């Protein structure tokens, strides 16, 4: 029988915080985002709701974001690159470094 | 960018239904999904390759258990369903 | 001689919030920002200490911001337009609508 | 709107002044500038003291409120 190898302990970068993947993602990004967020212990919401803390979006600023802020003033909007960067560097990077805001 | 921190591809090609009522559901889901598995939702149980615990969800699929999840990981492969 | 008038009541929508005016500002924008922040009960900090919550900047994203995020992860970076708009609407508006993020 | 009452006034307001917080708020809200201690030389008015900056015009907390009531600058008190 094959030998047992160690179970790698998954890094807890997001500590149970709540994400929602907004809009469309190209190719296999959606699946990749779900894998990383889940792996690093982020809770994925089924839809935009008042528990969401991070909205991950590959699309530019959207009027829906503004409406959402009215019931959840604490919302943060971030590019998928943020999540990919946390994986690459193996740590929690500031989401502000990848934030999404209205185009100046 | 380092083999030491790269996530394992263990459950590639597995479409698992993991009943919410499962003991340790949260972590099982985390490690399963982390290691390249796909979860099926309760309305799509018919397309599941594997089903954990409940034998009746989809008898056509392979019956697995928490033991099977850790066994696959430790062996670094898909072992016979247990 | 004019008659004594009551003290004008000032709105408090900036209360409990700490600002820090970063970098240089065009024309008289600096004291204009100081006026609004102060008038509406906000707190202005000298240096970018740990109490700072919002960093107002007319300049683009700056490497200094990332370094500041190392000690104060909860920092928000916003443009003057935010404070100006809070004064026009006489209410606390969501800073996200005027956020400052790095250029990818 | 924010009244323009203290336009041109650069005041040194000592932190130990009674009711300091409300004094600064209204003074600044109504177009006044405060001057930091290290920049005392640029002050036009000084509150609470008389010999800290002899050149500047001395005023009291009462003067700030008196100006606000009249909606203009009044005699230094």
UniProtKB/Swiss-Prot annotation, chains A, C:
<comment type="function">
    <text>Scaffold protein involved in DNA single-strand break repair by mediating the assembly of DNA break repair protein complexes. Negatively regulates ADP-ribosyltransferase activity of PARP1 during base-excision repair in order to prevent excessive PARP1 activity. Recognizes and binds poly-ADP-ribose chains: specifically binds auto-poly-ADP-ribosylated PARP1, limiting its activity.</text>
</comment>
<feature type="domain" description="BRCT 2">
    <location>
        <begin position="9"/>
        <end position="100"/>
    </location>
</feature>
<comment type="subunit">
    <text>Homodimer. Interacts with polynucleotide kinase (PNK), DNA polymerase-beta (POLB) and DNA ligase III (LIG3). Interacts with APTX and APLF. Interacts with APEX1; the interaction is induced by SIRT1 and increases with the acetylated form of APEX1. Interacts with (poly-ADP-ribosylated) PARP1.</text>
</comment>
<protein>
    <recommendedName>
        <fullName>DNA repair protein XRCC1</fullName>
    </recommendedName>
</protein>
Curated annotation (Swiss-Prot), chain B:
<protein>
    <recommendedName>
        <fullName>DNA ligase 3</fullName>
    </recommendedName>
</protein>
<feature type="domain" description="BRCT">
    <location>
        <begin position="6"/>
        <end position="81"/>
    </location>
</feature>
<comment type="similarity">
    <text>Belongs to the ATP-dependent DNA ligase family.</text>
</comment>
<comment type="subunit">
    <text>Isoform 3 interacts (via BRCT domain) with the nuclear DNA-repair protein XRCC1. Interacts with POLG. Interacts with POLB.</text>
</comment>
<comment type="function">
    <text>Isoform 3 functions as a heterodimer with DNA-repair protein XRCC1 in the nucleus and can correct defective DNA strand-break repair and sister chromatid exchange following treatment with ionizing radiation and alkylating agents. Isoform 1 is targeted to mitochondria, where it functions as a DNA ligase in mitochondrial base-excision DNA repair.</text>
</comment>
């Amino acid at each position: 029988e094959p030998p047992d190898l160690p179970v790698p302990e998954l890094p807890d970068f997001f500590e149970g915080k709540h994400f929602f993947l907004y809009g469309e993602f190209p190719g296999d990004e959606r699946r990749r985002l779900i894998r990383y967020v889940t792996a690093f212990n982020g809770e994925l919401e089924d839809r935009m709701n008042e528990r969401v803390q991070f909205v991950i979006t590959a699309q530019e600023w959207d009027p829906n974001f503004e409406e959402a802020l009215m019931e959840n003033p604490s919302l943060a909007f971030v590019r998928p690159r943020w999540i990919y960067s946390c994986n690459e560097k193996q740590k929690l990077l500031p989401h502000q470094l990848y934030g999404v805001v209205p185009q100046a | 960018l380092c083999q030491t921190k790269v996530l394992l591809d263990i459950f590639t090609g597995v479409r698992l239904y993991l009943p919410p009522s499962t003991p340790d559901f949260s972590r099982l889901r985390r490690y399963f999904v982390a290691f390249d598995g796909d979860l099926v939702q309760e309305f799509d149980m018919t397309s599941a390759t594997h089903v954990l615990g409940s034998r009746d969800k989809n008898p056509a699929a392979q019956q697995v258990s928490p033991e099977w999840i850790w066994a696959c990981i430790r062996k670094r492969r898909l072992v016979a369903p247990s």
